[PDB]
Amino acid sequence: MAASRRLMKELEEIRKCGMKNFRNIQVDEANLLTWQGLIVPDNPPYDKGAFRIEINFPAEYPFKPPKITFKTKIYHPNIDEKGQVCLPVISAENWKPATKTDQVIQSLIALVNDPQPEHPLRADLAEEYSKDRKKFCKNAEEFTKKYGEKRPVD
């Protein structure tokens, strides 16, 4: 476990930096390579809840990009219905071993706040967004309230 060492300092650093848009950061003792927590967005209806995500960051971190999968249902085009993600931060063509969870997490928050209908995972969800953010917002309000994690009060 070389990766894990870096991931530990980087995690403590993350929380310290200001666990705001990213909270409930936890790491297992044995499987410390894998991360779990939630991300509190601002733009989409976070009042009702948040989005729980899990970042599988193997020992092979400097060999290959990690994967992320949302546990909670999503209505954001940058993620798939099975919670899967495809962002440049962990894209094969942009596999940078210099990247870390700071880049990953801030990506989700960045795309969950401000989604790119340019060419995301589900262009469709981006289409209904780009035609009418109001159904995106209201469907989100409910999606969050169905399966979104309970965001903290602070």
Cβ contacts of 46 within 8 Å, gap of 6 or more: 40, 144, 151
Which residues belong to the active site? 86
Give the CA-trace dihedral at 28, 31, 32, 33, to 10 degrees: -150
**Cα separation, 75 vs 126, whole angstroms:** 9
- Hey, where are the domains in the chain? 1-154
- Topology at the third CATH level for domain 1-154: Ubiquitin Conjugating Enzyme (3.10.110)
Q: Which residues pair with 27 in a beta bridge?
A: 35
